């Protein structure tokens, strides 16, 4: 070998009986649920927020329909009128434009 790359960074748990253990990582939904916990939401609002955050793809788009979100709740007084309000509140999060219905929604938000 004319040239050799430097060894990549590796680690292993020392002074611990279950060797190598593990490490937690932050994802898009994990970082979105963190913001949901720190905003003023009611119980039903928090439930709707979790429901629509679970449906966010890696791109951050909303793969499931709003009507399907309303169906998933299956709760009275949880029509699309308030699901939309919670959806807009979530769309106005740190990755601005996340959880958007389609491409037009991203640009408009």
């Amino acid at each position: 070998t004319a040239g050799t790359p430097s060894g990549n960074g590796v680690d292993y748990q020392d002074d611990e009986l279950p060797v190598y253990q593990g490490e937690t990582t932050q994802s898009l939904q994990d970082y979105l649920m963190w913001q949901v916990e720190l905003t003023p939401f009611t119980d039903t609002d928090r439930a709707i927020a979790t429901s629509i955050v679970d449906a966010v793809d890696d791109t951050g788009y909303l793969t499931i329909q709003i009507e399907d979100i309303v169906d998933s709740i299956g709760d009275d007084e949880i029509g699309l009128e308030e699901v939309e309000a919670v959806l807009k509140r979530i769309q106005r999060f740190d990755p601005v434009g996340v959880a958007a219905k389609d491409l037009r929604d991203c640009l408009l938000i």
Binding site: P40, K88, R92
Partner: protein, 308 residues
């Protein structure tokens, strides 16, 4: 009822060494004027120092120049010791070009309009072959104390190009100060003291001018003791409430509930705002829908609410 010291017998040993005498002094005042003067003169005297350099080929400090004996870091450390005396300006640029053999010194710095090189035999660089040249631009500024190059950031407000050679600035022309109190030759008076001050500098500041500057600083500082006497912000808030484009029924309801600003509203919880007459479950979600597009959830908590 106290005698006042006079500036007499100022004698200059060398271009840097000098002696200053204050002939008439009372019993204890010798040290009070002295130690104060030493502290002022060692701490806060104005001067001029090299601030940054621009060599042709070199773009940083950890490089080398072909034909030059010393590294760029050593050249910058040499330039840090360059002593100049500018008049009427604070940002003179000292262009320097020299091609050939032998040490390069301030002497061969291009003769500026009003810039004095106190010692022209101060070497800064060495050339080692005939077909080599050095060309650099040196910026000199006026200041008061030690200003490290790393500690200053306002210079980075405008982006500096790759090729700058900034050096720490000291700005202090005084290197050593000693004072001593003797007995005055005045025989008519019972006993008087004489204060002699020895200052060693870099040749940039005059001794008498330095003493005058220190005394002026002391007087301005003492001016305070002569007569001691003495014995809801974020722009989205504080916005007109008719900026949310609410429905008709909300306008009277908000007016009825004395909601006139944006911040006061976001302080209202769902359960207590529902108690307002004819609010409407669907109309309440309309209020929340609009405030959600702004990013303003209901139930916030501000501390002080101004009338504006």
């Amino acid at each position: 009822e106290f005698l006042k010291p006079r500036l007499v017998d100022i004698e200059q040993v060398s271009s840097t060494h000098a002696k200053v005498t204050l002939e008439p002094l009372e019993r204890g005042f010798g040290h009070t004027l002295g130690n104060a003067l030493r502290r002022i003169l060692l701490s806060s005297m104005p001067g001029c120092a090299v601030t940054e350099v621009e060599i042709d080929g070199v773009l940083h400090e950890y490089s080398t120049k072909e034909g030059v004996q010393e590294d760029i870091l050593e050249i910058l450390l040499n330039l840090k010791g360059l002593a100049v005396r500018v008049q009427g300006k604070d940002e003179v640029i000292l262009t320097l070009n020299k091609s050939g053999i032998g040490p390069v010194t301030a002497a061969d710095i291009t003769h500026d309009g009003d810039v004095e090189i106190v010692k022209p035999q101060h070497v800064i660089c060495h050339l080692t072959d005939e077909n080599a040249s050095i060309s650099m631009r040196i910026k000199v500024q006026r200041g008061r104390g030690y200003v490290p190059a790393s500690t200053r950031i306002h210079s980075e407000e405008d982006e500096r190009p790759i090729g700058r050679l900034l050096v720490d600035a000291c700005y202090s022309p005084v290197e050593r100060i000693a004072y001593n109190v003797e007995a005055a030759r005045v025989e008519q008076r019972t006993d008087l003291d004489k204060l002699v001050i020895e200052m060693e500098t870099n040749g940039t500041i005059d001794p008498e001018e330095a003493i005058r500057r220190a005394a002026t600083i002391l007087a301005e500082q003492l001016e305070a003791f002569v007569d001691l006497r003495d014995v809801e912000f974020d722009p989205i808030l504080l916005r007109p409430v008719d900026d949310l484009e609410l429905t008709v029924r909300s306008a009277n309801c908000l007016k009825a509930e004395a909601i006139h600003y944006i911040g006061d509203l976001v302080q209202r919880t769902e359960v207590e705002l529902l108690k307002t007459p004819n609010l409407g479950k669907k109309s309440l979600t309309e209020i929340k829908d609009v405030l959600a597009s702004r990013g303003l959830s209901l139930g916030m908590r501000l501390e002080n609410w101004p009338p504006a």
